[PDB]
Amino acid sequence: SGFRKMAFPSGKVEGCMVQVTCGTTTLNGLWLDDVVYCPRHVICTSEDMLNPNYEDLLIRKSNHNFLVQAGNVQLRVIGHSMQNCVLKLKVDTANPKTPKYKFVRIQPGQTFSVLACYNGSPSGVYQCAMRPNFTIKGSFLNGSCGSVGFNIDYDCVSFCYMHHMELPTGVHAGTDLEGNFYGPFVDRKTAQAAGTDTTITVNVLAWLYAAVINGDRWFLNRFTTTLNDFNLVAMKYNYEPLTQDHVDILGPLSAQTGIAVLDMCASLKELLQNGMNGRTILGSALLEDEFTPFDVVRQCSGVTF
Amino acid sequence: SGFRKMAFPSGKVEGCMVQVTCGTTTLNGLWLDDVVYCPRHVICTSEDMLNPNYEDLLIRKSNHNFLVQAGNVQLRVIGHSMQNCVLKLKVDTANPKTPKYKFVRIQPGQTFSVLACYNGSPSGVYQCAMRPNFTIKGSFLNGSCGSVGFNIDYDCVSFCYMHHMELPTGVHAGTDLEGNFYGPFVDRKTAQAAGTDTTITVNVLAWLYAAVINGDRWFLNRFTTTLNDFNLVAMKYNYEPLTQDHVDILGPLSAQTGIAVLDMCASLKELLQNGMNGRTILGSALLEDEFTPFDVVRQCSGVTF
Ligand SMILES: *C(=N)[C@H](C[C@@H]1CCNC1=O)NC(=O)[C@@H]1[C@@H]2[C@H](CN1C(=O)[C@@H](NC(=O)C(F)(F)F)C(C)(C)C)C2(C)C
Ligand SMILES: *C(=N)[C@H](C[C@@H]1CCNC1=O)NC(=O)[C@@H]1[C@@H]2[C@H](CN1C(=O)[C@@H](NC(=O)C(F)(F)F)C(C)(C)C)C2(C)C
């Protein structure tokens, strides 16, 4: 028993992190086979970042201008190209620690582990949700760019995020590993705003299932609802619409607990209308939306890698 | 910016986890050089666990009765002994992935990363505090025993916890790597109770410093207090006494923010007496006590390994 925010074990990603330096600018890169992937703003001076022309900056760079270090070892750069907002540095050495991997673009509402890194060295691991406004609530300082987000499925690392920048209210924005931003953000040092987030309804329901599995059952009521009536009532509390796809992915938790999804929706409706009356759910005084249905099943049935 | 519950990168510990099976019973072991350390209840049938005589069970075991697997590879057991509540299995192969390591006994109020494991395979990593009642709020299922807790200091893994059991209200108990329990618990399947926990005052103060560093400052008042008056007022809220040792370890955060420790204590006194008046601190509606002063500094200044 017990329910904790849990990250994937980071080892498979730790063996892929390198340091990339171009002139004055240093950040992290991800070394897979004989390619290093890193944020393209490595080629920028702090002045260039205010209004960069990356194509123009990159013409005036050579292979040798990129210093790539795997611990103490320099990796020789033998080619370079830009794909959207990421640089690809071909190196003369394949990373012997390359795991089986895929690049995936995650959907809003889905979670991943972040391995926060500085100077090519891992510092910490935590779990994030891709918010509906295409930001993450991370923890990143100067030098963190090129830190990656990932999921692990048995032996296979699905890389989904590379860190680029911090917005107002300390939230974070970045790209997939093809260099395409999540959300309407650009890699330019100019004021940008996230704009309005929403509560991930399916994840709140997943976490209420987690709570029941752990013996927290006070919020279960005797009622059901229609999907229609639930979505009508929940809209005013800035909850995203619950779709039949969402109901389908809750099926395993519904089946395991013998609580129909629309019965749990009736309990959620009462929490939204009445509040928690000074009670906690899994130790929290607020409804939690950063656990997916898969996150609940994996932890409350012990999947390994 | 941003402040997240963050675990140490797990790779150095992932390369030490093996599966140990004795007859019918399987759990995890930690392979360092040519020794495997695991909970001694691996030698028990479920019936033996009700009232075990471990010394008697172990006499009737041979080296070959211990099946140790590192992924697919069986490690030959060439010797065995019991130290308190852990078994030590000497194997014929030194673990080539053994990190620099130490065994440490952690103090109540200190944190560590847990690598939850099943069948010798890592599943997840999370952060725990050793509670003042010598339990941890973990997430552990059947087969999790032998999962370890640790801290990483540059290259050096300090192992501090090995998992043995689950108590009432889903809290967890275990040993140091010399097999000595934290708290008054025994490895016997009979009802045992944790008894009353306390709030780790120095960690609540560390987290209020984290909040200020992140721009959450509404709770800062114009007052100071004496250590004496603070401890008198806080006692009724089941906060542990704040000692001069605790004030000393807050010094770096105090120095960094320019907020004296007793000024923050005056702010904490007002939160305890008045509540949060419907406000949050770093997104929480409750005061958080599972971040050490070191945890705040490391995250809010980016230490790597
Ligand atoms: C990469 N190492 C950093 C990561 C930042 C630093 C503080 N916390 C983080 O997550 N990335 C940057 O410094 C990027 C980089 C120029 C400016 N920048 C920003 O993150 C800035 N934010 C923005 O410009 C904004 F608002 F648009 F998001 C900053 C004010 C420094 C936080 C580039 C090329 C975008
Ligand atoms: C090791 N793999 C498990 C870990 C447990 C299983 C459920 N969650 C956990 O953390 N350890 C055990 O099963 C130990 C083991 C016998 C019984 N046991 C317990 O954890 C039990 N608890 C207690 O006996 C109590 F209350 F004293 F802590 C159980 C009821 C199964 C949770 C031994 C030898 C103690």
mmCIF file with all atom_site columns, C-alpha atoms and ligand atoms in Angstrom, chain A residues 1-2, chain B residues 25-28 39-42 44-46 48-50 52 54 117-118 138-147 161 163-168 170-173 181 185-193, ligand 2:
data_model
loop_
_atom_site.group_PDB
_atom_site.id
_atom_site.type_symbol
_atom_site.label_atom_id
_atom_site.label_alt_id
_atom_site.label_comp_id
_atom_site.label_asym_id
_atom_site.label_entity_id
_atom_site.label_seq_id
_atom_site.pdbx_PDB_ins_code
_atom_site.Cartn_x
_atom_site.Cartn_y
_atom_site.Cartn_z
_atom_site.occupancy
_atom_site.B_iso_or_equiv
_atom_site.pdbx_formal_charge
_atom_site.auth_seq_id
_atom_site.auth_comp_id
_atom_site.auth_asym_id
_atom_site.auth_atom_id
_atom_site.pdbx_PDB_model_num
ATOM   1  C CA  . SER A 1 1   ? 0.000  0.000   0.000  1.00 0.00 ? 1   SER A CA  1
ATOM   2  C CA  . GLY A 1 2   ? 0.806  3.702   -0.007 1.00 0.00 ? 2   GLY A CA  1
ATOM   3  C CA  . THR B 1 25  ? 10.127 -17.004 -1.165 1.00 0.00 ? 25  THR B CA  1
ATOM   4  C CA  . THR B 1 26  ? 11.515 -14.334 -3.595 1.00 0.00 ? 26  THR B CA  1
ATOM   5  C CA  . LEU B 1 27  ? 12.598 -10.738 -2.879 1.00 0.00 ? 27  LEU B CA  1
ATOM   6  C CA  . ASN B 1 28  ? 15.287 -8.193  -3.850 1.00 0.00 ? 28  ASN B CA  1
ATOM   7  C CA  . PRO B 1 39  ? 16.130 -9.254  4.262  1.00 0.00 ? 39  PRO B CA  1
ATOM   8  C CA  . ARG B 1 40  ? 16.607 -12.464 6.326  1.00 0.00 ? 40  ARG B CA  1
ATOM   9  C CA  . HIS B 1 41  ? 12.852 -13.374 5.938  1.00 0.00 ? 41  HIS B CA  1
ATOM   10 C CA  . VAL B 1 42  ? 13.724 -14.723 2.456  1.00 0.00 ? 42  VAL B CA  1
ATOM   11 C CA  . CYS B 1 44  ? 10.900 -18.109 5.765  1.00 0.00 ? 44  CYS B CA  1
ATOM   12 C CA  . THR B 1 45  ? 7.766  -19.866 4.544  1.00 0.00 ? 45  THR B CA  1
ATOM   13 C CA  . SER B 1 46  ? 4.695  -17.625 5.016  1.00 0.00 ? 46  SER B CA  1
ATOM   14 C CA  . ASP B 1 48  ? 7.449  -19.442 9.488  1.00 0.00 ? 48  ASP B CA  1
ATOM   15 C CA  . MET B 1 49  ? 6.970  -15.630 9.306  1.00 0.00 ? 49  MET B CA  1
ATOM   16 C CA  . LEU B 1 50  ? 4.160  -15.748 11.962 1.00 0.00 ? 50  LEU B CA  1
ATOM   17 C CA  . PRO B 1 52  ? 10.247 -17.203 13.064 1.00 0.00 ? 52  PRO B CA  1
ATOM   18 C CA  . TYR B 1 54  ? 15.839 -17.246 11.986 1.00 0.00 ? 54  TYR B CA  1
ATOM   19 C CA  . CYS B 1 117 ? 11.989 -3.014  -6.934 1.00 0.00 ? 117 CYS B CA  1
ATOM   20 C CA  . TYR B 1 118 ? 10.185 -6.302  -7.757 1.00 0.00 ? 118 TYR B CA  1
ATOM   21 C CA  . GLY B 1 138 ? 6.400  4.758   1.071  1.00 0.00 ? 138 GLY B CA  1
ATOM   22 C CA  . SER B 1 139 ? 4.678  2.817   -1.699 1.00 0.00 ? 139 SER B CA  1
ATOM   23 C CA  . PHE B 1 140 ? 5.451  -0.901  -1.521 1.00 0.00 ? 140 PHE B CA  1
ATOM   24 C CA  . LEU B 1 141 ? 3.634  -4.046  -2.618 1.00 0.00 ? 141 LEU B CA  1
ATOM   25 C CA  . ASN B 1 142 ? 4.251  -7.787  -2.284 1.00 0.00 ? 142 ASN B CA  1
ATOM   26 C CA  . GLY B 1 143 ? 7.802  -8.652  -3.489 1.00 0.00 ? 143 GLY B CA  1
ATOM   27 C CA  . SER B 1 144 ? 9.217  -5.154  -2.651 1.00 0.00 ? 144 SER B CA  1
ATOM   28 C CA  . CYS B 1 145 ? 11.363 -6.288  0.351  1.00 0.00 ? 145 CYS B CA  1
ATOM   29 C CA  . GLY B 1 146 ? 15.086 -5.633  -0.181 1.00 0.00 ? 146 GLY B CA  1
ATOM   30 C CA  . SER B 1 147 ? 14.336 -2.366  -2.031 1.00 0.00 ? 147 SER B CA  1
ATOM   31 C CA  . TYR B 1 161 ? 17.413 1.802   4.338  1.00 0.00 ? 161 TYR B CA  1
ATOM   32 C CA  . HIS B 1 163 ? 12.614 -2.387  3.134  1.00 0.00 ? 163 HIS B CA  1
ATOM   33 C CA  . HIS B 1 164 ? 11.101 -5.187  5.368  1.00 0.00 ? 164 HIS B CA  1
ATOM   34 C CA  . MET B 1 165 ? 7.417  -4.572  6.167  1.00 0.00 ? 165 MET B CA  1
ATOM   35 C CA  . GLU B 1 166 ? 4.211  -2.560  6.135  1.00 0.00 ? 166 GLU B CA  1
ATOM   36 C CA  . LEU B 1 167 ? 2.459  -1.393  9.347  1.00 0.00 ? 167 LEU B CA  1
ATOM   37 C CA  . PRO B 1 168 ? -1.086 0.019   9.841  1.00 0.00 ? 168 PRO B CA  1
ATOM   38 C CA  . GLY B 1 170 ? 0.049  2.028   4.975  1.00 0.00 ? 170 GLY B CA  1
ATOM   39 C CA  . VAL B 1 171 ? 3.381  3.140   6.524  1.00 0.00 ? 171 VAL B CA  1
ATOM   40 C CA  . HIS B 1 172 ? 6.664  1.225   6.147  1.00 0.00 ? 172 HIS B CA  1
ATOM   41 C CA  . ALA B 1 173 ? 9.474  -0.067  8.360  1.00 0.00 ? 173 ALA B CA  1
ATOM   42 C CA  . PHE B 1 181 ? 15.575 -1.839  12.461 1.00 0.00 ? 181 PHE B CA  1
ATOM   43 C CA  . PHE B 1 185 ? 9.815  -3.138  15.106 1.00 0.00 ? 185 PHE B CA  1
ATOM   44 C CA  . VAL B 1 186 ? 10.703 -6.814  14.540 1.00 0.00 ? 186 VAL B CA  1
ATOM   45 C CA  . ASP B 1 187 ? 10.547 -8.887  11.338 1.00 0.00 ? 187 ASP B CA  1
ATOM   46 C CA  . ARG B 1 188 ? 7.659  -11.055 12.521 1.00 0.00 ? 188 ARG B CA  1
ATOM   47 C CA  . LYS B 1 189 ? 4.175  -11.273 11.013 1.00 0.00 ? 189 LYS B CA  1
ATOM   48 C CA  . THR B 1 190 ? 2.292  -10.122 14.137 1.00 0.00 ? 190 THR B CA  1
ATOM   49 C CA  . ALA B 1 191 ? 0.355  -6.854  14.756 1.00 0.00 ? 191 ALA B CA  1
ATOM   50 C CA  . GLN B 1 192 ? 2.769  -3.989  15.562 1.00 0.00 ? 192 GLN B CA  1
ATOM   51 C CA  . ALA B 1 193 ? 1.912  -0.247  15.793 1.00 0.00 ? 193 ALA B CA  1
HETATM 52 C C1  . LIG C 2 .   ? 8.296  -7.791  1.507  1.00 0.00 ? 2   LIG C C1  1
HETATM 53 N N1  . LIG C 2 .   ? 8.371  -8.139  0.274  1.00 0.00 ? 2   LIG C N1  1
HETATM 54 C C2  . LIG C 2 .   ? 7.010  -7.438  2.242  1.00 0.00 ? 2   LIG C C2  1
HETATM 55 C C3  . LIG C 2 .   ? 6.612  -5.972  1.982  1.00 0.00 ? 2   LIG C C3  1
HETATM 56 C C4  . LIG C 2 .   ? 5.172  -5.626  2.398  1.00 0.00 ? 2   LIG C C4  1
HETATM 57 C C5  . LIG C 2 .   ? 4.088  -6.358  1.648  1.00 0.00 ? 2   LIG C C5  1
HETATM 58 C C6  . LIG C 2 .   ? 2.932  -5.372  1.571  1.00 0.00 ? 2   LIG C C6  1
HETATM 59 N N2  . LIG C 2 .   ? 3.628  -4.091  1.622  1.00 0.00 ? 2   LIG C N2  1
HETATM 60 C C7  . LIG C 2 .   ? 4.838  -4.167  2.150  1.00 0.00 ? 2   LIG C C7  1
HETATM 61 O O1  . LIG C 2 .   ? 5.580  -3.209  2.366  1.00 0.00 ? 2   LIG C O1  1
HETATM 62 N N3  . LIG C 2 .   ? 7.148  -7.701  3.664  1.00 0.00 ? 2   LIG C N3  1
HETATM 63 C C8  . LIG C 2 .   ? 6.279  -8.472  4.338  1.00 0.00 ? 2   LIG C C8  1
HETATM 64 O O2  . LIG C 2 .   ? 5.338  -9.056  3.798  1.00 0.00 ? 2   LIG C O2  1
HETATM 65 C C9  . LIG C 2 .   ? 6.496  -8.583  5.839  1.00 0.00 ? 2   LIG C C9  1
HETATM 66 C C10 . LIG C 2 .   ? 7.160  -9.895  6.197  1.00 0.00 ? 2   LIG C C10 1
HETATM 67 C C11 . LIG C 2 .   ? 6.167  -10.713 7.010  1.00 0.00 ? 2   LIG C C11 1
HETATM 68 C C12 . LIG C 2 .   ? 4.880  -9.920  7.146  1.00 0.00 ? 2   LIG C C12 1
HETATM 69 N N4  . LIG C 2 .   ? 5.201  -8.621  6.528  1.00 0.00 ? 2   LIG C N4  1
HETATM 70 C C13 . LIG C 2 .   ? 4.460  -7.506  6.555  1.00 0.00 ? 2   LIG C C13 1
HETATM 71 O O3  . LIG C 2 .   ? 4.842  -6.489  6.015  1.00 0.00 ? 2   LIG C O3  1
HETATM 72 C C14 . LIG C 2 .   ? 3.094  -7.567  7.228  1.00 0.00 ? 2   LIG C C14 1
HETATM 73 N N5  . LIG C 2 .   ? 3.084  -6.563  8.268  1.00 0.00 ? 2   LIG C N5  1
HETATM 74 C C15 . LIG C 2 .   ? 3.350  -6.909  9.524  1.00 0.00 ? 2   LIG C C15 1
HETATM 75 O O4  . LIG C 2 .   ? 3.533  -8.051  9.896  1.00 0.00 ? 2   LIG C O4  1
HETATM 76 C C16 . LIG C 2 .   ? 3.472  -5.767  10.529 1.00 0.00 ? 2   LIG C C16 1
HETATM 77 F F1  . LIG C 2 .   ? 2.298  -5.260  10.812 1.00 0.00 ? 2   LIG C F1  1
HETATM 78 F F2  . LIG C 2 .   ? 4.048  -6.172  11.652 1.00 0.00 ? 2   LIG C F2  1
HETATM 79 F F3  . LIG C 2 .   ? 4.218  -4.778  10.072 1.00 0.00 ? 2   LIG C F3  1
HETATM 80 C C17 . LIG C 2 .   ? 1.899  -7.478  6.269  1.00 0.00 ? 2   LIG C C17 1
HETATM 81 C C18 . LIG C 2 .   ? 0.583  -7.674  7.038  1.00 0.00 ? 2   LIG C C18 1
HETATM 82 C C19 . LIG C 2 .   ? 2.023  -8.593  5.236  1.00 0.00 ? 2   LIG C C19 1
HETATM 83 C C20 . LIG C 2 .   ? 1.836  -6.131  5.535  1.00 0.00 ? 2   LIG C C20 1
HETATM 84 C C21 . LIG C 2 .   ? 7.448  -10.234 7.643  1.00 0.00 ? 2   LIG C C21 1
HETATM 85 C C22 . LIG C 2 .   ? 8.482  -11.310 7.943  1.00 0.00 ? 2   LIG C C22 1
HETATM 86 C C23 . LIG C 2 .   ? 7.342  -9.186  8.730  1.00 0.00 ? 2   LIG C C23 1
#
